[PDB]
Amino acid sequence: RVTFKDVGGAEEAIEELKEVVEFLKDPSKFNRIGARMPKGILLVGPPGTGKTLLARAVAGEANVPFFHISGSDFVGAARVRDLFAQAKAHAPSIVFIDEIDAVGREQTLNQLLVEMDGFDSKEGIIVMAATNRPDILDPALLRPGRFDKKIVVDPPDMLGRKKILEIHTRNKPLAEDVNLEIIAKRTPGFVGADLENLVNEAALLAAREGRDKITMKDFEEAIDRVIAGPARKSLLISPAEKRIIAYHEAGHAVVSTVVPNGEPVHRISIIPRGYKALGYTLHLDKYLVSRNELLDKLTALLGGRAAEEVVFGDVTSGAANDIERATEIARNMVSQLGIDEEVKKIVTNSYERAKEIIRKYRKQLDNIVEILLEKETIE
Amino acid sequence: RVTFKDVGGAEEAIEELKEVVEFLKDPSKFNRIGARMPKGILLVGPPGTGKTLLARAVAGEANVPFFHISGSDFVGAARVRDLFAQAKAHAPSIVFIDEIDAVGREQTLNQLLVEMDGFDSKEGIIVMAATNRPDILDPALLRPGRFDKKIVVDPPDMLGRKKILEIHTRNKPLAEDVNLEIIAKRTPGFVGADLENLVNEAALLAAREGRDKITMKDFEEAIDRVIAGPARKSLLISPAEKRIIAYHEAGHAVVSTVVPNGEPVHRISIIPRGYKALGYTLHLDKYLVSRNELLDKLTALLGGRAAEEVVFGDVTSGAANDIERATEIARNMVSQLGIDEEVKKIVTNSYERAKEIIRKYRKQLDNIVEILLEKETIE
Ligand SMILES: Nc1ncnc2c1ncn2[C@@H]1O[C@H](COP(=O)(O)OP(=O)(O)OP(=O)(O)O)[C@@H](O)[C@H]1O
Ligand SMILES: Nc1ncnc2c1ncn2[C@@H]1O[C@H](COP(=O)(O)OP(=O)(O)OP(=O)(O)O)[C@@H](O)[C@H]1O
Ligand SMILES: [Mg+2]
Ligand SMILES: [Mg+2]
Ligand SMILES: [Zn+2]
Ligand SMILES: [Zn+2]
Numbered sequence: 001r002v003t004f005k006d007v008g009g010a011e012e013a014i015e016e017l018k019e020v021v022e023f024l025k026d027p028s029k030f031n032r033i034g035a036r037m038p039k040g041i042l043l044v045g046p047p048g049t050g051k052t053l054l055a056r057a058v059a060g061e062a063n064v065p066f067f068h069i070s071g072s073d074f075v076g077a078a079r080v081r082d083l084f085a086q087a088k089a090h091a092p093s094i095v096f097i098d099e100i101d102a103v104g105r106e107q108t109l110n111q112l113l114v115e116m117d118g119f120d121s122k123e124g125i126i127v128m129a130a131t132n133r134p135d136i137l138d139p140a141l142l143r144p145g146r147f148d149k150k151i152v153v154d155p156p157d158m159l160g161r162k163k164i165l166e167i168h169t170r171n172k173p174l175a176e177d178v179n180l181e182i183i184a185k186r187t188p189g190f191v192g193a194d195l196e197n198l199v200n201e202a203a204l205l206a207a208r209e210g211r212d213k214i215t216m217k218d219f220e221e222a223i224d225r226v227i228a229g230p231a232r233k234s235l236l237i238s239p240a241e242k243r244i245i246a247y248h249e250a251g252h253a254v255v256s257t258v259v260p261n262g263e264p265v266h267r268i269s270i271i272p273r274g275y276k277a278l279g280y281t282l283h284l285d286k287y288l289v290s291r292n293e294l295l296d297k298l299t300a301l302l303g304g305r306a307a308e309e310v311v312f313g314d315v316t317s318g319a320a321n322d323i324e325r326a327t328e329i330a331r332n333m334v335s336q337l338g339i340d341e342e343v344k345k346i347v348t349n350s351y352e353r354a355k356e357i358i359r360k361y362r363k364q365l366d367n368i369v370e371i372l373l374e375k376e377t378i379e
Numbered sequence: 380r381v382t383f384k385d386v387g388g389a390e391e392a393i394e395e396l397k398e399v400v401e402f403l404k405d406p407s408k409f410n411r412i413g414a415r416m417p418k419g420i421l422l423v424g425p426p427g428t429g430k431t432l433l434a435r436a437v438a439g440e441a442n443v444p445f446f447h448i449s450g451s452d453f454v455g456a457a458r459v460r461d462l463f464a465q466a467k468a469h470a471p472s473i474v475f476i477d478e479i480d481a482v483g484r485e486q487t488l489n490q491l492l493v494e495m496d497g498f499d500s501k502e503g504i505i506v507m508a509a510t511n512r513p514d515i516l517d518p519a520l521l522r523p524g525r526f527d528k529k530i531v532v533d534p535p536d537m538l539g540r541k542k543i544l545e546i547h548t549r550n551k552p553l554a555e556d557v558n559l560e561i562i563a564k565r566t567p568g569f570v571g572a573d574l575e576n577l578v579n580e581a582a583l584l585a586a587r588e589g590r591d592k593i594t595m596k597d598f599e600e601a602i603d604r605v606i607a608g609p610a611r612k613s614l615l616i617s618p619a620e621k622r623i624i625a626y627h628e629a630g631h632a633v634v635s636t637v638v639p640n641g642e643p644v645h646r647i648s649i650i651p652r653g654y655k656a657l658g659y660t661l662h663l664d665k666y667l668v669s670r671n672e673l674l675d676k677l678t679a680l681l682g683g684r685a686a687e688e689v690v691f692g693d694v695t696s697g698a699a700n701d702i703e704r705a706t707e708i709a710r711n712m713v714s715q716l717g718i719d720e721e722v723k724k725i726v727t728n729s730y731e732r733a734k735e736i737i738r739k740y741r742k743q744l745d746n747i748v749e750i751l752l753e754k755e756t757i758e
Contacts, residue, residue, distance in 0.1 A: 314671045323717070
């Protein structure tokens, strides 16, 4: 059994799931005012971030049964029928499906669509699913009445990493020299699964010497064992890679602040945070289409690639993704505001414009990077 | 009965196995702090290096029973069931499987997976296996909870060879002119099995003449008998082959030291040492993907092949493996940083770059080779 006290660094996701817990505890409070709940909910995120753990914590905060199946184990149609019948017989309950992209071969998909349409939501039944490849899902699953809510689960930041370390050492004896805050600052790029495996390695080092406490030296030696060798499990960002990433992020922020139609900036960080930063389209944005605001959007989207070329003379894979998105936007501009030769010159002009802004504001760009290299995030 | 005193030239491997010996002597010391041990361990290395001997030495350092089976002898499912039942009845024990690649026909594999999931590790039970073809194993065996630790066993160097000769002559009478250090310098490329057979041949030469001691002349004549003829058993590196190998290894080191993104060099040797140098992938590496560091990695990987062509005008099988790896890296570069014609020119440009570095630093390359030809290793 787990609850929300076993989860670290997922404040925004836990905020959205509070509604589900209340509904499962007393459906009648929603029915008496005509509030209609979605039938399915989708969790999307990178592997190891805790999508399966979040679902189990929902069923713990409300004492309801938990019926689950795994999509990687896929007779198929018969198994889906059995699972939904169990949930109906016990009215307020949960149905959970894992690796839904594996199963969502044509008979199994058809049966699932029949089951979603055939149960009554007012009883207190809800369906949940998880995936890390949302862009290959069948469009029939996402139509209204089937799966119309999405929640994004993100990698942790420095304060999120420190919380997870505390959760997994509360049943272990520690020495007085252990500083979990220093350990958190040395593991950027780790996820919750990586941090849980790191605590086990430090305990093996202490046990192999017969000691009954874990010291600060055990933790530091465990970091080197998990990132190198024939049996390695994790990747972290080195100090050299950190400097290049900081210049890329600060390049976006400076160009947006200078163009008149650019959007305001609220946060800069070394760790990705949104669904766009994670590389998802989610099968998905202005009422009015204008030339001046479309050109300002293109220039700011090439700000990260321009700072790399002016400062280092290099190019990363994130900058190559940015250039591909810009070409798609320009192609739609030509067909709406009044062909390949025309698209090519629009992108080239925007790139030159961004490079001049980077040269003229080089001093401010350097100042931002220095603060980022010590704090990792500016709110 | 054998212990760690019967093993030579395996210091790093013996270091990793100290944890297993402590666990088998008293499991409760691991349980009281929540340290969780792996269920299976894999030993990988070339034939004759002592993988079966290392496993038997673990069961000697800790007085526990030793149950073993051989994979080349494969009713199959029934034999696997019997072996695991014996180990459970005697709680702290060892299960050893040899030639696991032969057995890992579909019924026997399924039974093994059932047994691995059905025993309790906290009792003090552990499973070990060995192979020299790790890349053909079924991926189901390597999933978490089954076989998640790997240890590499390497061929011996000059000081490792001298130790093995001492182990196998401690019960034999030697003359005063025998110098085991000179014998070690004359057998590069031998493994422990070859060295153990060489001592027996020298004893037969002495016994055939009625003598009661083994002289230095007996050892020198035994070398020629085991490497040639209708009954030959061993291969060694000749002085002509030694010179070509030294230039190949020094070519990698010089190119890495000159490119800005190359990695530091800690050791150069005539004998292979790592799992990459032995030709294994092990079913397995940077957080950030960048163009400048990917090109520097390609250039250094072709350094050995470039020194062969500039100095001798030849090509070996190791250089042909290097060219195949480079083509795989370049192919992934084209699809991530922005087809066959494009891949071909990336590899050709990197090869030309390495050849110019070799010509410009020819003097330093010659100096390193001379030291290597006398010491065999530079730490
Ligand atoms: N925020 C977290 N707090 C604590 N533990 C976490 C957290 N995130 C992940 N873990 C650990 O991760 C381990 C496995 O991750 P989990 O299965 O929950 O994630 P996932 O996103 O569903 O992964 P996968 O893609 O592998 O299925 C769990 O044992 C849990 O201990
Ligand atoms: N490091 C060593 N020290 C001493 N003897 C060794 C060493 N390595 C191998 N031997 C000798 O090798 C002989 C056989 O090798 P062993 O079976 O232990 O190796 P292996 O890697 O399991 O071989 P194979 O692939 O043939 O099964 C043993 O009798 C042992 O005498
Ligand atoms: Mg999981
Ligand atoms: Mg053997
Ligand atoms: Zn960018
Ligand atoms: Zn090479």
